[PDB]
Symmetry: D2
Subunit: 375 residues, 4 copies
């Protein structure tokens, strides 16, 4: 049990602020167009970073150490709920966090400032590889980068690429980040159209002998895959909060259809009653896992296993809820116009984002063994 009652006043006010923003901009007509444009207007994105977050650290580190993850989760779940869509916000929050972790204050200052002044980021994160094999090597007097990055959000048009690479230019192979201008010769972007999550266009980006300057390398407090890997767990919480939100939007449509429509009403049908309770059980479980993992961080008691179990369960559960919602709306609602069919497609995509189910099993099983040995 974790619903409105049970949040603090401060947390509830945050929701109020986010809900007033979402309702204002995320109309069905607006969202339909923005899905088509694969992106949000300057005004909408700027209004998001201008939001009154009620003192929570949502786009800044309130406590000067970490963000407030539960707060971030409430923001993402609510915007995903109102919009019924995959929004760019969670991807910005993670990219911001990752940049801060690996680069000096002087290096990140320009980018943070741009984000606060426009609500957009001038760089795109490029980490995943097809199968890590992206290298930087010295030829003579030059540093040259070779590799291929996959699933690069906004890879096609981003002004710059924040690229993870093995640096080999040292005497006798280490983890490294490079902020590479998209204008450097040898960078090729190949847009990948996915069946869902239209507003988060990705690309495959190939680096073919790209000259990189030393000043481009991130010189930060954090180092190594270890640090990156921790940061990507936040990405899983974000993704699950989005899945929960969208799933919740599908459930609202199902319920509204069920009471409204008649076939006496469709909601007095045993089949529909069970589907409804089945869906509310899944939503309850999703929310409990997402909120629990998030509140652990904020206590300073994060466990890897919580995040792994959450990621294993929620996107698949979200997809099943959205699918059940389609079944309740009947033949219409397999129509592209209906947001439930977009939601269903979005949620299916969450089963690939930020590590698959199969990867969560590999991460979780030793932690489970460890947990039962330890008790």
């Amino acid at each position: 049990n974790a619903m409105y009652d049970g949040l603090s006043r401060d947390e509830q006010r945050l929701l109020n602020h986010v809900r007033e923003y979402g309702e204002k901009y995320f109309t069905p007509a607006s969202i339909s167009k923005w899905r088509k444009d694969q992106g949000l207007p300057d005004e909408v994105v700027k209004a998001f970073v201008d939001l009154d977050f009620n003192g929570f650290g949502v786009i800044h580190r309130r406590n000067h150490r970490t963000y407030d993850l539960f707060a971030q989760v409430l923001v993402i779940e609510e915007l995903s709920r109102i919009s019924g869509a995959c929004l760019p916000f969670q991807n910005d929050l993670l990219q911001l966090q990752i940049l801060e972790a690996f680069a000096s204050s002087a290096q990140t200052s320009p980018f943070r400032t741009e984000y606060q002044d426009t609500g957009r980021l001038s760089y795109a994160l490029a980490i995943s590889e097809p199968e890590m094999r992206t290298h930087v090597t010295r030829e003579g007097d030059t540093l040259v980068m070779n590799g291929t990055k996959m699933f690069v959000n906004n890879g096609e048009y981003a002004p710059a690429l924040l690229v993870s690479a093995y640096d080999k230019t040292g005497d006798d192979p280490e983890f490294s980040f490079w902020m590479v201008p998209r204008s450097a010769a040898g960078i090729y972007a190949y847009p990948e159209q996915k069946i869902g999550q239209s507003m988060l266009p990705f690309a495959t980006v190939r680096f073919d002998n790209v000259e990189v300057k030393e000043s481009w390398r991130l010189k930060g407090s954090s180092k190594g895959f270890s640090q990156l890997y921790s940061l990507l767990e936040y990405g899983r919480v974000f993704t699950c909060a989005a899945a929960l939100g969208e799933a919740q939007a599908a459930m609202e449509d199902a319920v509204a259809w069920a009471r409204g429509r008649e076939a006496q009403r469709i909601a007095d049908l045993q089949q529909v009653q069970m589907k409804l309770t089945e869906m509310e059980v899944k939503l309850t479980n999703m929310r409990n896992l997402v909120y629990g993992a998030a509140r652990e961080y904020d206590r300073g008691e994060h466990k890897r296993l919580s995040v792994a179990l959450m990621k294993y369960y929620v996107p698949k559960a979200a997809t099943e809820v959205a699918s059940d919602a389609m079944q309740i709306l009947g033949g219409r609602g397999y129509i592209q116009e209906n947001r439930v069919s977009s939601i269903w497609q979005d949620c299916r995509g969450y089963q690939f984002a930020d590590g698959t189910d199969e990867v969560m099993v590999v991460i979780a099983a030793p932690l489970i063994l460890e947990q039962y040995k330890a008790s």
Copy 2:
């Protein structure tokens, strides 16, 4: 068990003929374009009705009484397998059959001839209603039709609409079919874009006081909903054969990826091994249900329950196979380019076509009671 071995030589030759046709036309490049055009070229459709069906009654009644349903199923399953797509063929076969049942030979002769000469039908079937309330009534010296038909395949552009209606023009409400020219005033078509099955574009069609002539009414051997309802069961067999075929195509891609790719090979992974066996079990079951229901008809021993159990199981099973195939292909393959993601969308649509799962439960449970009382 029902695979190649186990078919007669005649049945196997039929497959050979269909497979040679499919391979010839249904290239990935061709299918991609035809998905985009929402329809097949004249040459391809004409080549289908020109096919050597090895003496089976596929587009004609070989035995002069019925079509050869198992043969039709092999044709539809194979074309769906090769194409990885929802093809128009099964919808033509049913529309042809339904026309013959309800109209005189003189009435159907022009339409059959056009189909044999071009591979296309000049009419579209309009039966489903939103919730039957489509009426024909007399005003004075005129017959006037009012109603709304839903999910009308090619409703938007078809030259004529074969419409099911309550005729009230008799003295003291009966089932009736009307072949209405699309040019009759008061006909409004509203295209419905679905998330899958692009080549089978549907429309909502409203009839607003449309003047219908007496010569348009179908005067046939068959009469009443009873007859129509029987015919629509064939439509369920067709739809399930399509689901099986497409599902089978998804499985082939999964297997080819699994052996080819490596992550040593991806097919030596316990997770993938189980998914594979799980998928082959579902395909085995689907095929057994579809082939069994079809062979029952051809024996003259059709049972309603067979068709209901088949329709309950297969589209959902097909969707799960296609989804498992996506999961095996990984992140790519949630990409629109990959046919597995279209297949997944197609198969989800089969859960609405020709009666839902929930409708099959309502049909099947009394037949089950009857079956266990009877033994």
Copy 3:
């Protein structure tokens, strides 16, 4: 997320006290014998009510109004975990609570005192009917009871039966409770041996014209089905806490087998890894639902829907975990000796106790509609 860290110190000490008691008495050898005797020894039951509950209201109302339900849940989950069995404790707690609700202090005082002095209750609750039709009627100068009660825990040997009945002895049919001595003529008990939950033997009890005295009727603050129905929701929380505990015991055996045994170790098997994570996800969800529903009560913010969703999910989830544990232990462990096979049987029984899944759907769907209208 709700595990040891996250409980207060007070809650943790309670667990320590309960765990020291459980470990002391509930040995495999002891439990095996007690399963066989279908009951616990006087010493064990007395030690339970003598337990230091760390000031929580577990067998008494600390706050003078209600019990402390979350505390009760921790007690029941832990004893079920250590024992791997269905224990009588939760059934006593509910029977105690129900007695207090419907009877005067003078009426309940003897029974409470006996329970505190011996750890046993001298009465058995008789409410469920086969399908409410148990009546009390006046003949002449007598009051006569007729009806049949089902699933009466310890119905066969309990000294007295607390019976729910329609009283018709008033002038112009109302809810009523009667504390009937088992020695009253016309009471017939029929023991029902179940496949699981051996220590909670039930009976069908028929009342055939039993003379009941007026002094036997419960004269309490609480009245009507409404009040009874609320009390039975506590019974659902108790039952789910037991299911969670037993399921948790099955998981521990699975994990211990997996690491210990080898087939290199059985836990490095992809199949086992996934089963393990799947099980830990279900346990996480169960615990979240049970703890959440319990903490709601203690806040004074109980919602019927929480208890309905919990009861819908947990016993079936518990059965699946226990079954997965059996599959991991292999062929042995379908052996009666192995506690995992008893646990599996116990948990299957929880799907009938305190209202079925199907009854939870009927309860939950209107509350869900209400919840989404209200927001």
Copy 4:
């Protein structure tokens, strides 16, 4: 589709003969007692081998080469259906077949004769090992056997043990079978009580330096694990036919309860209607897989994959049907008296017998790869 219509007259007559035998002996009262005695009376077992099998090779090789497997399947499915129990017959049929394969005619003649004259076998098959490590070695002038066999049907009391072992007495480790008298010193049997399948009592048998004579070694046409492994696939078909039969018995009780009882009738309940159709779909699939695998053998076109897919699907499906039947019968029927709860327990056991689900995945995945490469 594979039901009564669809069998030949000969096959149908066989069923009639088996059904008349089953109905005659397998009364609920008789079965209840025989479950308690863990075995069938001499009269019942003798009547089985005296059955008129209508010329099929059920306990003999009609064609002089193989048994008639489909016929055997009909016999086992029908007896399991009528009895609602796990019967010894299928275990005898396999043991008979295995003996014939590995031993000379002179060696098997006494055992076949005893079986035909009494309906019982004087030996018990001992093959499975805990983890193959059972050896025969020479000490000086003696041959000595050491090993431990698991899950030995009737291991505790069988007059003789047919034991699989590595023979090392040759100069420079080979597969071998030994018919060992239970009276040989050093044989220890440990009865294992399982939660289901009472009539098929198993034991762990330890061989501690047992002197074996050379005349005890089976000298047969068939040799090696390869041959044994093929024979054990028949055991999987038998086990699945038993699972199907018992599952079918559970379904009949569910249906009879549903129409008979009322809660207007319980069968007009949407929840029950769906459970019913879900169950009949699973039974349809089970029967199709079992009958298909069996008919393949009889055609001489056995594929390993058919048997693997069948074994993967059917016992788990059978358990789900039996469980759904329990849920429909309600609270009673978790009672030991009700045969549905025994059936449920039996079917759960089939998930371990003759190779687990997890073992079928390992067997099936390469055959699937092979199958899709081959086409």
